[PDB]
Amino acid sequence: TLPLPEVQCFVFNVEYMNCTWQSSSEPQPTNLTLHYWYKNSDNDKVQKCSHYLFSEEITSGCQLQKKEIHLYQTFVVQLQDPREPRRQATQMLKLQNLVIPWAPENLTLHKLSESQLELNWNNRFLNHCLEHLVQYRTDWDHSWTEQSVDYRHKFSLPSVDGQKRYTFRVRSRFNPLCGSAQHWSEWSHPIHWGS
Amino acid sequence: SQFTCFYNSRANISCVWSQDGALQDTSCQVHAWPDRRRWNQTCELLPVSQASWACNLILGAPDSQKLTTVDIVTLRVLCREGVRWRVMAIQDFKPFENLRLMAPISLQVVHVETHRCNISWEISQASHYFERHLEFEARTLSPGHTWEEAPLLTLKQKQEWICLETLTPDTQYEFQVRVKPLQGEFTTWSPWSQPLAFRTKTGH
Amino acid sequence: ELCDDDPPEIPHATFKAMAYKEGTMLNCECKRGFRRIKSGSLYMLCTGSSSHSSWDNQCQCTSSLPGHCREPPPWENEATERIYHFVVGQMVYYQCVQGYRALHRGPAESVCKMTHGKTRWTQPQLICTG
Amino acid sequence: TSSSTKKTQLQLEHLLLDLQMILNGINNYKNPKLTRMLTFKFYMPKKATELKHLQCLEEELKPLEEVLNLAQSKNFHLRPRDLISNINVIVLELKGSETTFMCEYADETATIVEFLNRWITFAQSIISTLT
Numbered sequence: 299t300l301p302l303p304e305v306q307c308f309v310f311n312v313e314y315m316n317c318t319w320q321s322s323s324e325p326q327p328t329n330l331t332l333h334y335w336y337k338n339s340d341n342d343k344v345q346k347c348s349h350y351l352f353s354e355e356i357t358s359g360c361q362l363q364k365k366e367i368h369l370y371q372t373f374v375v376q377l378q379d380p381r382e383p384r385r386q387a388t389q390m391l392k393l394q395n396l397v398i399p400w401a402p403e404n405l406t407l408h409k410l411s412e413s414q415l416e417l418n419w420n421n422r423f424l425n426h427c428l429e430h431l432v433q434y435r436t437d438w439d440h441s442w443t444e445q446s447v448d449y450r451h452k453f454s455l456p457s458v459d460g461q462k463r464y465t466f467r468v469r470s471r472f473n474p475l476c477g478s479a480q481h482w483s484e485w486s487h488p489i490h491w492g493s
Numbered sequence: 494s495q496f497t498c499f500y501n502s503r504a505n506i507s508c509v510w511s512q513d514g515a516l517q518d519t520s521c522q523v524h525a526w527p528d529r530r531r532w533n534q535t536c537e538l539l540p541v542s543q544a545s546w547a548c549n550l551i552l553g554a555p556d557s558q559k560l561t562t563v564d565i566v567t568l569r570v571l572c573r574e575g576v577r578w579r580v581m582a583i584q585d586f587k588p589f590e591n592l593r594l595m596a597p598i599s600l601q602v603v604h605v606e607t608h609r610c611n612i613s614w615e616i617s618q619a620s621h622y623f624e625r626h627l628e629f630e631a632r633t634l635s636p637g638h639t640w641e642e643a644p645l646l647t648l649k650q651k652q653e654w655i656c657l658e659t660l661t662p663d664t665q666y667e668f669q670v671r672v673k674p675l676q677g678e679f680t681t682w683s684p685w686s687q688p689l690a691f692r693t694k695t696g697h
Numbered sequence: 698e699l700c701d702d703d704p705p706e707i708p709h710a711t712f713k714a715m716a717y718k719e720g721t722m723l724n725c726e727c728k729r730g731f732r733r734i735k736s737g738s739l740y741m742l743c744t745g746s747s748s749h750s751s752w753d754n755q756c757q758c759t760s761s762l763p764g765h766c767r768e769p770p771p772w773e774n775e776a777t778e779r780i781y782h783f784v785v786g787q788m789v790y791y792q793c794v795q796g797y798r799a800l801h802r803g804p805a806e807s808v809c810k811m812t813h814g815k816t817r818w819t820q821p822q823l824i825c826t827g
Numbered sequence: 828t829s830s831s832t833k834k835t836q837l838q839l840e841h842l843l844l845d846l847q848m849i850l851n852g853i854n855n856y857k858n859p860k861l862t863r864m865l866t867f868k869f870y871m872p873k874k875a876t877e878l879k880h881l882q883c884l885e886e887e888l889k890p891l892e893e894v895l896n897l898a899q900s901k902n903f904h905l906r907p908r909d910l911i912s913n914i915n916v917i918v919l920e921l922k923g924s925e926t927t928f929m930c931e932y933a934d935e936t937a938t939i940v941e942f943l944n945r946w947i948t949f950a951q952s953i954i955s956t957l958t
């Protein structure tokens with residue numbers, strides 16, 4: 299046993315991918331190299347990284363472009379020690395479970411009655427693929443009230459106390475229609491429904 | 494004439510047939526014959542209006558999923574002519590295009606204050622196929638008014654609770670709620686829940 | 698009524714059951730280069746709730762008494778090893794292979810016992826030497 | 828164009844819910860038989876990128892059902908016949924009305940989990956293109 303750092307991959311709004319590892323957990327700083335290919339498919343050829351991320355003059359990650367991304371095909375990566383080959387760690391990743399989307403945008407509120415208001419927001423690209431968490435609170439609440447929301451990007455508030463002051467926010471996630479991603483986006487810029 | 498049927502999204506299809514004037518001892522039936530299942534179902538039409546007959550087609554356990562988005566059932570209305578079956582009306586029934594779920598159930602007060610009330614319910618017999626693509630609508634009965642003047646409160650998401658604001662202290666209210674899936678071109682709202690009776694709290 | 702794991706491996710010895718308690722399962726493994734038929738069975742089940750224990754399915758491969766069930770007849774192309782899934786109360790009998798002296802002291806069989814909520818196989822008291 | 832696309836989107840989504848419900852049904856702490864269910868060998872498509880490839884799933888539905896019969900316990904109470912006869916009819920509309928395609932299978936077999944994860948991924952890939 300002579301372990302190699304676990305590699306992490308995140309696909310950022312399906313625009314690109316960061317793969318990283320923290321290397322410093324090994325005597326002798328080492329420029330570790332990364333290769334990848336897609337399993338049981340067309341172009342099951344091995345690929346060098348060609349775009350290395352560094353940390354203190356020692357490789358630390360690898361950024362892949364959209365062209366190189368194929369969700370829905372099993373992505374196989376391998377960390378390789380340059381001096382001793384006989385020590386390599388490979389993993390099979392499901393890229394469609396590692397998408398983080400960007401934060402919801404253009405948060406807007408509008409009344410559909412004196413006492414009823416509705417909240418809308420935008421997401422950069424994916425849409426039919428995302429689900430969301432809405433969180434709101436007043437000046438009176440000791441915590442948030444959340445509620446998950448399907449592909450509609452609407453949230454009803456059928457009963458508002460016009461006297462309280464409301465703080466709204468949303469985050470999105472690539473699940474469960476086009477992927478089974480588990481990590482959420484950053485929160486949106488919050489908005490308020492005033493005194 | 495007119496022949497309307499709805500599907501509760503599980504194992505229950507209910508029918509309503511209205512005719513412009515049958516004669517004495519008019520024995521009718523609805524026959525369901527699906528286009529890719531191994532079974533048939535029938536039921537005896539029973540009078541409801543002066544000229545309305547109604548029927549329930551029961552396809553299995555209350556919570557069993559007995560049909561799909563791709564099923565097409567040929568519903569037929571049949572009445573006894575001497576010995577032989579005369580077809581009154583015939584329909585290509587797309588069960589997930591004619592949805593009406595059961596009333597929501599188990600209405601209960603989670604918390605009452607003096608100006609506020611959090612009520613919650615459960616949906617009775619919904620397909621798992623819906624996921625979160627449901628929609629709710631509620632209404633509050635307050636002392637001075639009747640049900641039909643009460644604002645329809647809109648939940649454009651699957652939220653199985655509501656938090657009523659700006660209520661009068663120490664006052665009796667009544668509460669009602671209903672559901673609709675987003676899917677189905679002829680899909681309607683459920684009937685309304687049993688009204689939940691509740692009372693706000695006195696102030697100082 | 699099903700054992701979590703399977704009988705212990707005793708060095709230089711294999712185990713058979715002379716009879717199979719109802720509910721025992723046998724996988725439909727094939728020889729290399731073969732595969733169980735499209736829309737086939739995954740396993741054969743030992744049912745005998747009519748008093749005359751049978752095997753509910755039957756395995757198939759193609760190119761790429763009273764109470765218990767008997768050993769099932771060999772099908773077309775099998776794997777060398779049959780993989781069984783044994784129910785609780787099942788008895789299994791160890792013996793050294795052709796080329797080894799058995800050293801006995803206590804039962805040469807394993808039983809699948811229930812304890813509170815858990816399953817276990819008793820250790821056969823047997824050593825094999827060349 | 829849009830309607831038929833939405834009709835297909837929906838059918839796939841429904842299929843997806845069936846597969847994911849089984850997965851969550853068996854792939855969890857409170858299924859005492861899971862370790863034994865992983866010993867069953869399932870067969871995979873060589874490639875699976877368009878609806879016709881579902882012939883590969885349809886063929887493995889009979890085994891699938893046998894595996895579900897074993898999960899039948901007082902936890903998920905997940906009656907198979909109802910569920911497999913449903914998955915079946917959905918699949919048959921999706922793979923469509925040509926019925927000419929003989930399936931190609933991969934060399935290596937897969938545990939039921941690798942199997943359900945494969946076909947879920949299949950549906951999600953198609954769905955993601957459909958709008």
Ligand SMILES: *[C@@H]1O[C@H](CO[C@@H]2O[C@@H](C)[C@@H](O)[C@@H](O)[C@@H]2O)[C@@H](O[C@@H]2O[C@H](CO)[C@@H](O[C@@H]3O[C@H](CO)[C@@H](O)[C@H](O)[C@@H]3O)[C@H](O)[C@H]2NC(C)=O)[C@H](O)[C@H]1NC(C)=O
Pocket residue numbers: 499500501505506507547548549551555593594595596683684
């Ligand atoms: C199958 O469904 C029928 C009818 O349900 C209706 O249609 C379905 C498709 C859904 O959309 C439902 O939400 C919708 O209601 C059920 O029959 C109904 O049963 C109830 C209670 O037994 C009847 O209520 C009665 O109503 C009269 C008059 O309002 C009152 O006087 C009584 O006190 C009583 O509450 C209801 O009339 C009846 N509907 C009809 C028109 O037949 C049925 O029970 C259900 N079966 C199962 C097992 O699921």
Ligand SMILES: *[C@@H]1O[C@H](CO)[C@@H](O[C@@H]2O[C@H](CO)[C@@H](O[C@@H]3O[C@H](CO)[C@@H](O)[C@H](O)[C@@H]3O)[C@H](O)[C@H]2NC(C)=O)[C@H](O)[C@H]1NC(C)=O
Pocket residue numbers: 443444603611612613653654655656
């Ligand atoms: C009105 O009453 C209802 C019913 O009690 C309240 O809904 C409850 O809200 C809480 C707080 O968000 C939910 O807990 C959450 O559960 C999920 C797990 O699924 C978890 O991710 C969260 O961290 C949190 O623990 C709770 O499930 C939910 N109950 C149900 C069944 O919906 C509601 O908040 C009340 N409304 C107001 C305005 O207080």
Ligand SMILES: *[C@@H]1O[C@H](CO)[C@@H](O[C@@H]2O[C@H](CO)[C@@H](O)[C@H](O)[C@H]2NC(C)=O)[C@H](O)[C@H]1NC(C)=O
Pocket residue numbers: 310316351361
């Ligand atoms: C993906 O990888 C890139 C490249 O390493 C990261 O970009 C760096 O971000 C940190 C923190 O903001 C800064 O040191 C630099 O501004 C960036 N490095 C440069 C200029 O190459 C990025 O953070 C990673 N993650 C994301 C979310 O894209």
Ligand SMILES: *[C@@H]1O[C@H](CO[C@@H]2O[C@@H](C)[C@@H](O)[C@@H](O)[C@@H]2O)[C@@H](O)[C@H](O)[C@H]1NC(C)=O
Pocket residue numbers: 524526531532533569578
């Ligand atoms: C379902 O029904 C098929 C046709 O049934 C006939 O026509 C209908 C409209 C009724 O009048 C019925 O009494 C007639 O028998 C049958 O041929 C078919 O086998 C049935 N399916 C099953 C398996 O029940």
Ligand SMILES: *[C@@H]1O[C@H](CO)[C@@H](O)[C@H](O)[C@H]1NC(C)=O
Pocket residue numbers: 327328329355356357
């Ligand atoms: C890693 O590679 C870079 C450039 O290729 C180099 O500057 C750095 O010193 C290397 N580190 C080693 C080999 O220790």
Ligand SMILES: *[C@@H]1O[C@H](CO)[C@@H](O)[C@H](O)[C@H]1NC(C)=O
Pocket residue numbers: 404406418420
């Ligand atoms: C934000 O949302 C509103 C309300 O739907 C929309 O009409 C408006 O065009 C959007 N604005 C931006 C900046 O995208």
